[PDB]
């Protein structure tokens, strides 16, 4: 008919016990529309391309229509090539990359431009950029290039390659001058240990302005950085005060079906919100496919992934167009993808904390840039 009654959706998850899996299950359980999504979730090491491509080929031979999973720097090119060759959509909440196809929908919005706007707003000219090697170096190139145009002085420090003594020498060189400016671009699960390192042996107060380049400001424990003169400025994508996020979190709290793992609380992460909105865009795209009466059901079992005359299925372009032409309001706000498969037309709440509390200083858009408030 217009659409199959049950639609198989593949999934590549790094581990069984995670908050992202709980968000996936809850978002699947929330939907009650006639297009039902049957999940096939496989636990696969994301740092190995062989295991990931075996799982991808197994799910493709099973007959999935879209795959929701995570990747890394090692498996991004392989996933991009396979999705561009087999015309199979891949929806991911992982870090955005410049080298991608139109079949890869990255739910995580970019941050390499909001950070530059924030640095320009603060009139920073000499600072230390502490970055993570296994997170993508595009933002580091952008920072270095903007420094080249604007004659900045950036001291690039890698987290992996620097020991405690190197950090101590770097921070002594920082306290040699008066204005200590540090921009940290690293993930929360490592930024916690990084901030513990900063607060334990090093010190701050009356200066030491930090700009944390992350999508979640409430996801980290800033009590160690509190009660001091250090100023912390970050970015917030989701905040639980608006009507839709509060309603979603209230439905999550009073859930009749108990969630997996151990807990779903104690500083919930934004990646769970990205997973929730990924399930939501999948559901709305498939319901829009059913609404337009465009045939999606498979006419014959899918063959081997390694067929040399690999022809693309004709419904793949329709699936990609339906997944791309989506605009709804979810946990993270307005969800909308451009022609390149990345999120566009969104907002970030710029939040500053200077030994008083949490204060929103403005917001950044793709058109109005950083507007103060």
């Amino acid at each position, epitope marked *: 008919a217009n659409f199959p009654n049950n639609i198989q959706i593949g999934g590549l998850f790094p581990n069984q016990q995670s908050q992202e899996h709980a968000a996936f299950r809850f978002a699947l359980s929330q939907l009650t529309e006639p297009p039902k999504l049957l999940p096939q979730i496989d636990i696969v090491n994301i740092s190995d391309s062989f295991e990931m491509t075996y799982r991808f080929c197994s799910q493709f031979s099973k007959g999935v229509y879209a795959i929701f999973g995570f990747y890394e720097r090692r498996t991004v090119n392989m996933l991009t090539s396979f999705c561009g060759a087999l015309h199979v959509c891949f929806i991911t909440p992982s870090f955005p990359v410049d080298t991608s196809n139109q079949f890869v929908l990255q739910l995580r919005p970019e941050l390499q431009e909001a950070l530059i706007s924030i640095i320009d707003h603060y009139k920073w000219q000499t600072f230390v950029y502490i970055y993570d090697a296994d997170r993508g170096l595009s933002v580091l190139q952008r920072v270095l290039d903007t420094a080249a145009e604007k004659n900045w002085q950036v001291t690039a420090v890698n987290i992996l390659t620097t020991t405690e003594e190197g950090y101590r020498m770097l921070f002594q060189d920082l306290e040699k001058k008066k204005e200590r400016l540090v921009v940290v671009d690293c993930e929360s699960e490592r930024l916690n240990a990084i901030l513990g390192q900063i607060v334990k042996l090093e010190k701050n107060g009356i200066g030491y302005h930090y700009i944390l380049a992350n999508l979640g400001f409430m996801d980290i424990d800033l009590n160690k950085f509190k009660e001091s003169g250090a100023n912390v400025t970050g970015f917030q994508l989701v905040n639980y005060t608006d009507t839709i996020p509060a309603r979603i979190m209230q439905q999550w*709290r*009073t859930s009749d*079906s*108990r*969630d997996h*793992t*151990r*807990v779903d609380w104690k500083r919930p992460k934004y990646t769970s919100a990205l997973t929730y909105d990924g399930v939501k865009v999948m559901a709305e795209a498939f319901q829009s496919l059913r609404r337009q009466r465009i045939d999606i059901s498979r006419r014959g079992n899918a063959g081997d992934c390694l067929a040399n005359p690999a022809v693309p299925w004709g419904q793949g372009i329709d699936i990609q167009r339906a997944l791309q032409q989506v605009r709804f309001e979810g946990l993270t706000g307005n969800v909308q993808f451009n022609e390149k498969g990345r999120r566009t037309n969104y907002t970030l709440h710029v939040i500053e904390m200077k030994h008083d509390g949490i204060r929103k200083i403005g917001y950044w858009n793709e058109d109005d840039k950083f507007v103060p408030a």
Partner: single-chain antibody, 229 residues
Framework: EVKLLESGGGLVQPGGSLKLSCAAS????????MSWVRQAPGKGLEWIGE????????DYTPSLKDKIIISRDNAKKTLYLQLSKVRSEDTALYYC????????????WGQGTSVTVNIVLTQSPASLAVSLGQRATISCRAS??????????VHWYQQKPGQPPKLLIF???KLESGVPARFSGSGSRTDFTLTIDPVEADDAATYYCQQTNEDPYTFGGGTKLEIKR
């Protein structure tokens, strides 16, 4: 660990409305929803009422829904339950408890008091008595599944007569916070088991196994534990 204060237990007139003051000190009901449970003397506990953290919609007991009404304020963190046509059997020990799903430390029930106006399981041995420092194991057989939605959905509450009950083991993966009890669920656990080692005088209480897998959370007969001298 949140604090719960419940005092004012006393007899009332025939059919007069009674109210219990349950104060959430050190926290608020918005973080964890407050639920009232009524337990008869020498019998398992029953869910008297479940409320919401945002104070939007509240529930009642599955046995007597319209007979009792509970109103709670999260900002004031105060809950009061009232009823009509109170009988001799209706005067049971009512205690308020915060939601245990938020954290292990959040599973702190109120003091509870008595007045004079589900889950099916069997815990063995019923009569247990060991010296201090010994290891005690109690097996709680149940007719339902040993684990709901993958992980375990059972818990053990160490209640005493006239004292606030405490949950030691919950879901076989998170023990009691603040004071880590040596007894916790482990393994596949077809029957709920918790190896207490070493034992202590302060660790002598009635352990009742309540399964959250079967709706609703009702305390079973449990097993009695003391300190043999």
């Amino acid at each position: 660990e949140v604090k719960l204060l419940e005092s004012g237990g006393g007899l009332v007139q025939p059919g007069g409305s009674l109210k219990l003051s349950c104060a959430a000190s050190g926290f608020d009901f918005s973080e964890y929803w407050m639920s009232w449970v009524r337990q008869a003397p020498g019998k398992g506990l029953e869910w008297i009422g479940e409320i919401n953290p945002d104070s939007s919609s509240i529930d009642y007991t599955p046995s007597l829904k319209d007979k009792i009404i509970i109103s709670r304020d999260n900002a004031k963190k105060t809950l009061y339950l009232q009823l009509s046509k109170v009988r001799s059997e209706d005067t049971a020990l009512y205690y308020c408890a915060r939601p245990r799903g938020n954290y292990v430390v959040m599973d702190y029930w109120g003091q509870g008091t008595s007045v004079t106006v589900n889950i099916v399981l069997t815990q063995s041995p019923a009569s247990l008595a060991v010296s201090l420092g010994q290891r005690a194991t109690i097996s709680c057989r149940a007719s339902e599944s040993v684990d709901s939605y993958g992980s375990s959905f059972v818990h053990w509450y160490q209640q005493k007569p006239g004292q606030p009950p405490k949950l030691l083991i919950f879901l076989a993966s998170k023990l009691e916070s603040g004071v880590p009890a040596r007894f916790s669920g482990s393994g596949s656990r077809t029957d709920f088991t918790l190896t207490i080692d070493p034992v202590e005088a302060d660790d002598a209480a009635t352990y009742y196994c309540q399964q959250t897998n079967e709706d609703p959370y009702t305390f079973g007969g449990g097993t009695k534990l003391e300190i043999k001298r």
